[PDB]
Ligand binder design. Structure first.
Ligand SMILES: Nc1ncnc2c1ncn2[C@@H]1O[C@H](CSCC[C@H](N)C(=O)O)[C@@H](O)[C@H]1O
Ligand SMILES: Nc1ncnc2c1ncn2[C@@H]1O[C@H](CSCC[C@H](N)C(=O)O)[C@@H](O)[C@H]1O
Lengths: 173, 225
């Protein structure tokens, strides 16, 4: 048996920090990554300018739009915490990470074989052209572990959402 | 052994090179397979270098499929949301997409025009995802017509089991996502009677589109297949 000792507002956050470092993308794609990523529990979205990313910046205006999307998706998903969407930085400026995951076509390691649900999370995804093998080395040097997303080619948007889902939705959090 | 080589240029990355030579003990003449996400081929070691060099014997066909049938049962969604779902499910590996007319789904049917576009989408997405197999997109059917399944996972808000705690990679997969309003209490139960195990996609309410993506990602891309 038991007894309702005290009602409370439901836990909506994932528990640990989840920073998604995503390469700038063509079209409007990024807006969509931000929204869905907000629903999937990301806490920080850090756009990256990389070797093959077409865009290399982002006006103050484009960034404000991405922030309204995050806020709007936050309310829809039932979250109180609004993920911080930041100004794009260089891939070299990627900080050292306690635990990081990078989607790479070559790896064999699955996310469930690598993930420690107790520590913070750093996730990296490349642009439509992908990361340059020197960028993945840089990433591995930062602490990001290369992980597989299957035997099919995924749009960058999907890879980011898929990678994130296996870390949040997949762990039931 | 399958080894990652970006471009199939005949030169292996220092990583794959060390692994094949240091661990698997490769020798000139040793035949192995190379790939990069677009192609696959039978290679023969030419020099251990490093970096190890090889010559391509015969171009191969990359393994693209999940390996088992993956059927997505998705509730009819408003607007063109199902175009997104279809695109993502094709690149994520669904083998068939089955729209369902549910208690809370706004649309209750789908015309020839919509089915055509979704089919056009499946075809394009299969091409862009590298697949040859094109997911079949069937006309909608009532929830009740969902058949008994060998392995079914239904994304339910009121669920607690993780996918990785139930998933059997060897059996075919049947997946179910509800419409914007979500599955009713009677429906989830019915789906559960059909062989579906309710599953959680986390603590936040997700759009039906994102749920299907998440659920599919966890069963395919996640298992590296
Ligand atoms: N099957 C897969 N496994 C792991 N990551 C993948 C993936 N498919 C796509 N991605 C992710 O999505 C990004 C964009 S895919 C871009 C094209 C790819 N670089 C190529 O050479 O064809 C990749 O850099 C990676 O971050
Ligand atoms: N956190 C979650 N866990 C499992 N399934 C979810 C989910 N979030 C969304 N879904 C899936 O996405 C569909 C649309 S969400 C529908 C609204 C939701 N039932 C509510 O009123 O709270 C749901 O039917 C379910 O199939």
């Amino acid at each position: 048996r038991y007894r309702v000792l005290e009602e409370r507002r439901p836990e909506r956050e994932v528990g640990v920090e989840v920073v998604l470092y995503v390469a700038l993308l063509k079209g409007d794609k990024l807006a969509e990554v931000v929204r869905a990523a907000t629903e999937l529990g990301a806490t920080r979205i850090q756009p990256l300018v990389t070797r093959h990313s077409v865009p290399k910046e982002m006006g103050e205006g484009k960034l404000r739009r991405l922030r309204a999307v995050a806020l709007e998706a936050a309310k829809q998903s039932g979250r109180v915490v609004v993920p911080e969407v930041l100004p794009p930085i260089p891939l070299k400026a990627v900080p050292q990470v306690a635990q990081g995951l990078v989607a790479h076509v070559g790896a064999t390691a699955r996310v469930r074989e690598v993930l420690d649900p107790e520590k913070p999370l750093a996730l990296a995804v490349g642009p439509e052209g992908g990361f340059a093998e020197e960028e993945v080395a840089l990433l591995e040097a930062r602490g990001f572990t290369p992980v597989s997303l299957g035997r099919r080619i995924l749009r960058a948007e999907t890879a980011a959402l898929a990678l994130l889902a296996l870390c949040t939705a997949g762990e039931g959090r």
